[PDB]
Scaffold this active site. Sequence first.
Site, short mmCIF file in Angstrom:
data_model
loop_
_atom_site.label_atom_id
_atom_site.label_comp_id
_atom_site.label_asym_id
_atom_site.label_seq_id
_atom_site.Cartn_x
_atom_site.Cartn_y
_atom_site.Cartn_z
N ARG A 156 -3.15 11.64 11.23
CA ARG A 156 -3.78 10.36 11.51
C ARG A 156 -5.04 10.61 12.32
O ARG A 156 -4.98 11.22 13.40
CB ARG A 156 -2.84 9.44 12.28
CG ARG A 156 -3.45 8.08 12.57
CD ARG A 156 -2.50 6.94 12.26
NE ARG A 156 -3.21 5.67 12.21
CZ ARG A 156 -2.62 4.49 12.19
NH1 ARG A 156 -1.30 4.37 12.24
NH2 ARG A 156 -3.37 3.39 12.13
N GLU A 190 0.83 -1.19 0.00
CA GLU A 190 0.00 0.00 0.00
C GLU A 190 0.87 1.25 0.00
O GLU A 190 2.03 1.23 0.41
CB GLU A 190 -0.95 0.03 1.20
CG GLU A 190 -0.38 -0.63 2.44
CD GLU A 190 -1.16 -0.27 3.68
OE1 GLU A 190 -2.32 0.18 3.55
OE2 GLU A 190 -0.62 -0.44 4.80
N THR A 191 0.27 2.34 -0.47
CA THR A 191 0.98 3.61 -0.59
C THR A 191 0.97 4.35 0.74
O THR A 191 -0.03 4.33 1.46
CB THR A 191 0.33 4.47 -1.67
OG1 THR A 191 -1.05 4.69 -1.34
CG2 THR A 191 0.44 3.81 -3.03
N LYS A 192 2.08 5.00 1.05
CA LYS A 192 2.19 5.75 2.29
C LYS A 192 1.52 7.10 2.13
O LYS A 192 1.78 7.82 1.16
CB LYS A 192 3.66 5.92 2.69
CG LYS A 192 3.84 6.13 4.18
CD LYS A 192 5.27 6.52 4.52
CE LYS A 192 5.69 5.97 5.87
NZ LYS A 192 6.26 7.02 6.75
N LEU A 193 0.67 7.45 3.09
CA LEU A 193 -0.10 8.68 3.05
C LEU A 193 0.47 9.67 4.04
O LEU A 193 0.64 9.36 5.22
CB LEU A 193 -1.57 8.39 3.37
CG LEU A 193 -2.45 7.98 2.18
CD1 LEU A 193 -1.70 7.09 1.21
CD2 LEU A 193 -3.69 7.28 2.68
#
Length: 152
Positions: free
Chosen positions: A128, A121-124
């Site tokens: 948070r 998955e891509t880091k956002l």
Amino acid sequence: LLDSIASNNSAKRKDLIKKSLLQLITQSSALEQKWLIRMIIKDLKLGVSQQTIFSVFHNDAAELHNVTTDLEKVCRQLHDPSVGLSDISITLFSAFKPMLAAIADIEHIEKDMKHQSFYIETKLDGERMQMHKDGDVYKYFSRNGYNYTDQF
DNA sequence: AGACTTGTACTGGAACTCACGTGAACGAATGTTT
């Protein structure tokens, strides 16, 4: 006095903050004022871990604090040391400490996943947040348990 | 977020002690030779 000072800072009033601090100064000793300054700065440097304090307070307090994130409920429910909690799990309208991720070495990544398929998955990049929805009642909580519901 | 400091327990290793096994020497008895 601390509640008055905090609310009054939130209310954009300084004369009342000065009055409260003056009362605290006039009704305290040097050591008490030093400790009060430390609490205001939010650092005590007691040298004892928070985990140790929670463990001495009750057998199962770190888990409850992680699930709830409010010193009121932990202090209230866990009063008699003998009486414990049967099951502690995430509850509505109570912040829960988020689960983070650790550094990983690309070389042994498969080993870290027990030689099984995994998700990439891509880091956002950003805040948070966690959202609690019950009907049209919405609550938003940040990484550490601060309430950002007013903004969103 | 990242990096350094303090602590925390746990693991393994060093040293000491004992038990067990191997090597060598030996005094007395016995057998053989002169």
